[PDB]
Structures are given as structure tokens and as C-alpha cells.
Design a protein around this ligand. Structure first.
Ligand SMILES: *[C@@H]1O[C@H](CO)[C@@H](O)[C@H](O)[C@H]1NC(C)=O
Lengths: 105, 437
């Protein structure tokens, strides 16, 4: 039979009713290394916790992609004009790897 | 001094209510719910029972002349037969053959055990709920009985209590019900107009006064054979017996909140739903002034173990300087964790022990001593791992503290990942402002 945090009754023959409900139980260390906190938080309330993990992962990847795109746009607006002009080079001393416009010579 | 509070409607669950009027030492109230019940309104539409097929002795008349009549008692079947030649142990009686009159009549009536073995039907309506409450405070401990309706009082002493309207009404009863020998069912019965011959309430007679015994049991007579005397008829079996035989799965095992049902005033007892409000007025003579038991000084807390969620695992120690010994009320301000012990005395040593309980893993409750209050957080790791044979003693709200000590690093790594984007935005703004010129 299943049992949850609400309660389960008994009627086996003519015995008086018996009332039981489940504990909070679960396994894993709840104040330890990162790869048991998720296990503890997942064993209790199995639903909506993997949803939380997925949402956190989505936020992290969105942040990483946004930072990368902003850096790329900043680099382009930084030193696209030096790719223009007839000939010419990068100042190097003013900037060589701070904006990283390295493309042969 | 009126005060308001709300209590979950759970039997066998202590409740704490701390009164903190200024100019006096704050005190606590212990609330206990002891067997609340609920009672609906009844209407007693009609009654059902078995039927007796009253059939008198058959009428043989040896002249051949017909004789038909019809009185007003229920469901006569006026049938007359001709050309019958009955037999009898004396060989035969009379002489004329093929010219005889058989008059056979029958009807239905109630049974002898209709007074006892009958079943009743009722209609649901607005329902009022009993509430037996135990109240205690300093040197006072008393039970009472209220209505938890819009208005009622208790007057346990100089103080009065009013239990406001119920939060909701998820009554197990609904529309129409059937009551029969310490049991009820949510079975829709046919109306008083008519009923199918055999389903249920084939007799839909009214109250036990036995007036206008309606019946639709579909009698039908038949022509007797030539062998001997007969009274043949066709009669479907009583639907009351079939309904008793099938029965099954009474409403006692169908309450959507485990609400044990009784039958004397057709009541349902010991079920939890919603919460009950309360407003109490306490006289000024029920407590001492602030000149008694000043125990503020400084104050710090420590936690030994927090084996939580079962009965009480939060063993906490409180240390503080204080004046002369005396009583001191204690409670918890936040509802994350709750304590058991009411007002507790203080000795000159200044060390006391408390037993709290919670459902989370990083509680951040604020234990308040009868005049002071301090923050108190615990490292509540150990999850008890069994299945409990008794009730719960805490709120079901579980959530780690926003500051806490468990998920701090998760919050800080998320903040760092956001900070990289913030720095990227800032450097982009700087670059675009520089290149705009
Ligand atoms: C109130 O009195 C009853 C008397 O039987 C007792 O069982 C109960 O424990 C008392 N209440 C408290 C809080 O001690």
C-alpha cells in the first residue's frame, strides 16, 4: 500500500482502526558537499526539484551566453576600424591582448 | 483587552497564543481541540421496508355467475376465472363442470418489523459544528463547549472567548443521504413521485404513521391449472433485500478527510479542514505587573541536537543573567519552528533547556524570553529515518533560510555568475560611450 504525509487507516477484520502516516526520511547529507544537497532536496518532494535544477541550469547557460555575446560585441565595436584602413597595424603598446585583435600581420 | 488568533482545526495538537500587552509580563495560552463534530439538518422524506403480499383464501363459487368488485386499498388486481374444476382430498366437490367461478385477489402491505428493520432518507442542508476546546494558562486549566459559529462565548472565568466562522464547509454529506442502522450512504434515491419495481424504495411510504402506502411492485395474477386449487401470481423480489445484500463501502470509509461518522444526531466527528479564528478578552487581574521577574540582561542561545520532524528533537540551551527566581513565559515569534514547553521557571544559575521542533533543515526562529528576544539559528542536519505511528507536531511549511548556512554558497555562485554579466554590461557601456564621441 502507499503512504504519504497525510495518513493511512486500517480495518483488518474487527480490530480497532490504526492510523499511520509517513515520515520525512530520505537519504544523503543535507549540509555537506554539493553532490548530496541535490540528492537530499530531491528525495524529499521528488517533483518540482528537478524543475528547480533545470531552471538554475537554464539561468546559468543564459548568463554565460549573454556574457560571451556582450564580450564579442564589445570586441567588435572596440577594434573593427583597425581591420579597415589601407594597411596599418594594431598599436600593440596601447593594446595587443586587452582587446585581442590578432590576425596575422 | 481583545486579541485575535487563528488555529488549525487539528485534534490532538497543542496551540500556543502569547499575549504581549505592554506594562505587564507577557503570558501564554494553551489551546487544545478535543473532538470537534459536525451536524446537518434533516428532513425525513420517506421510509422504506419489506412488503407482505396479503392474499386471502381463494373464492370458489359453484354457480357460474360472475362477481366483480374493487375497493380502495392499494393495488387490487380484479381477476375472475371461469370454467375451473378444482380438486380436493375428498376427491372432488360439487357436480357441475366447466361452470365455476374462481375469484382470487391479493394486495401488499407493510411488514411486522417495519418498526425496527426500516431505513430512512434525508436531505442535506446547512450544517453546524460542535467544538470542544480546552483552555489553560497560569494556574488555570479548564474545558468547555462552543459553537465556533458567528457568535458564542465561553466565560471560563474573568476572560471570554469567541470562535468565529469556519474557513470553509467541505461537508462529506451532500444533497440527499440514506440512514440505516448506524450507517449512512451517498446514494441518490428516486423521488416520492414513483420508483422502479425493484431498484430501491419500491415502497416509498411516508413516516411510520402508515398512511398512503404507495407501492409499485407489479403484481400479476395467472389462470390456475386444472390439477387442483391454485393462487398463481408473479412477484419480483423486494429491492430492500437486494440493496441490503449489495450495500458495501459505507460512507465511514469514504470521508475525504478521514472524518469518522456517527449516527445518533447523524454527526461526523474528528476531521480536520480549514482553520478556526478566535477573539479573546482577558481581564487585567489575571496577570502580574512588570515589577516581577525581570530577566533581560544579555542573552545567547545554543543548540545541541536537532533530530527533527518526529516529535521534538530541537534540544536548545539558553544562557543569561537574571534577578530573583520566578516564572517566565517563552514562545517562538516566527512559525518556522515551534516549541513545546509553556512558561518555565528560572534559577539563579541562568541556564535553561528548551525542546523545539521544525520541518526544515536550517531553522531561523526567534525564541523570546518573557521580556527579551534574540536570534537563534541551528545546524539541523539529521533527518529521522523511520515511519512514525503517531501525529505531527509542527507546521508543514519547509524552506531553508534565505541567509542560512546550507545554500549560502549556491546563492553566492549565482551572484557571481550574475556579476560576470553585470561587468560585461558595464564594459560594454564604457566602450560604447568611448566610441560614440
Ligand atoms: C489539565 O487537567 C487535566 C486533568 O485530567 C490534565 O490531564 C491535563 O494534563 C491538564 N493540562 C495540562 C497542560 O497539564
Amino acid at each position: 500500500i502507499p503512504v504519504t504525509e497525510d495518513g493511512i487507516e486500517y480495518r483488518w477484520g474487527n480490530n480497532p482502526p490504526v492510523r499511520l502516516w509517513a515520515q520525512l526520511t530520505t537519504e544523503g547529507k543535507p549540509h555537506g558537499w554539493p553532490h548530496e544537497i541535490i540528492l537530499y532536496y530531491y528525495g524529499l518532494y521528488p517533483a518540482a526539484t528537478i524543475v528547480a535544477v533545470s531552471a538554475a541550469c537554464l539561468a546559468v547557460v543564459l548568463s554565460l551566453l549573454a556574457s560571451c555575446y556582450m564580450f564579442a560585441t564589445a570586441r567588435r565595436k572596440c577594434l573593427t576600424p583597425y581591420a579597415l584602413t589601407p594597411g596599418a597595424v594594431v598599436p600593440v603598446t596601447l593594446g595587443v591582448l586587452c582587446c585581442a585583435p590578432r590576425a596575422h600581420a | 483587552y481583545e486579541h485575535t488568533a487563528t488555529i488549525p482545526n487539528v485534534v490532538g495538537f497543542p496551540y500556543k497564543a502569547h499575549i504581549e500587552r505592554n506594562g505587564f509580563s507577557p503570558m501564554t495560552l494553551q489551546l487544545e481541540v478535543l473532538g470537534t463534530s459536525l451536524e446537518p439538518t434533516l428532513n425525513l422524506e420517506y421510509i422504506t421496508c419489506e412488503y407482505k403480499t396479503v392474499v386471502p383464501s381463494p373464492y370458489i363459487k359453484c354457480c357460474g355467475t360472475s362477481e366483480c368488485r374493487s375497493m380502495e386499498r392499494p393495488d387490487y388486481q380484479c381477476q375472475v376465472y371461469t370454467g375451473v374444476y378444482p380438486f380436493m382430498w375428498g376427491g372432488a366437490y360439487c357436480f357441475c363442470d366447466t361452470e365455476n367461478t374462481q375469484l382470487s385477489e391479493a394486495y401488499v402491505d407493510r411488514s411486522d418489523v417495519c418498526k425496527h428493520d426500516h431505513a430512512a432518507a434525508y436531505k442535506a442542508h446547512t450544517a453546524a459544528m460542535k467544538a470542544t476546546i480546552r483552555i489553560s494558562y497560569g494556574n488555570l486549566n479548564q474545558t468547555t463547549t462552543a459553537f465556533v459559529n458567528g457568535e458564542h462565548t465561553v466565560t471560563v472565568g474573568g476572560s471570554r472567548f469567541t470562535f468565529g466562522p469556519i474557513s470553509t464547509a467541505w461537508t462529506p454529506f451532500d444533497n440527499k443521504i440514506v440512514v440505516y442502522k448506524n450507517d449512512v450512504y451517498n446514494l441518490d434515491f428516486p423521488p416520492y413521485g414513483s420508483g422502479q419495481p425493484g431498484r430501491f424504495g419500491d415502497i416509498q411510504s411516508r413516516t411510520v404513521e402508515s398512511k398512503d402506502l404507495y407501492a409499485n411492485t407489479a403484481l400479476k395474477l395467472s389462470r390456475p391449472s386444472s390439477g387442483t386449487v391454485h393462487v398463481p401470481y408473479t412477484q419480483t423480489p423486494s429491492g430492500f433485500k437486494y440493496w441490503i445484500k449489495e450495500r458495501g463501502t459505507s460512507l465511514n470509509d469514504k470521508a475525504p478527510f478521514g472524518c469518522v461518522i456517527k449516527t445518533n444526531p447523524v454527526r461526523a466527528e474528528n476531521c480536520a479542514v480549514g482553520n478556526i479564528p478566535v477573539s479573546m478578552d482577558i481581564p487585567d487581574s489575571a496577570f502580574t505587573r512588570v515589577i516581577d521577574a525581570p530577566a533581560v540582561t544579555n542573552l545567547e542561545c545554543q543548540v545541541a541536537v536537532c533530530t527533527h520532524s518526529s516529535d521534538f528533537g530541537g534540544i536548545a540551551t539558553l544562557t543569561f543573567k537574571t534577578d530573583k527566581p520566578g516564572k517566565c513565559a517563552v514562545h517562538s515569534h516566527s512559525n518556522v519552528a515551534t516549541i513545546q514547553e509553556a512558561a518555565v521557571d528560572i534559577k539563579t544559575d541562568g541556564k535553561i533547556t528548551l525542546h523545539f521542533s521544525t520541518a526544515s533543515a536550517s531553522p531561523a526562529f526567534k525564541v523570546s524570553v518573557c521580556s527579551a528576544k534574540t536570534t537563534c539559528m541551528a545546524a539541523c542536519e539529521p533527518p529521522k529515518d523511520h515511519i512514525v505511528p503517531y501525529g505531527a507536531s509542527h507546521n508543514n511549511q519547509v524552506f531553508p533560510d534565505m541567509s542560512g548556512t546550507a545554500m549560502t554558497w549556491v546563492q553566492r555562485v549565482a551572484g557571481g555568475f550574475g556579476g560576470l554579466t553585470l561587468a560585461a554590461v558595464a564594459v560594454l557601456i564604457l566602450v560604447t560611450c568611448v566610441t560614440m564621441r
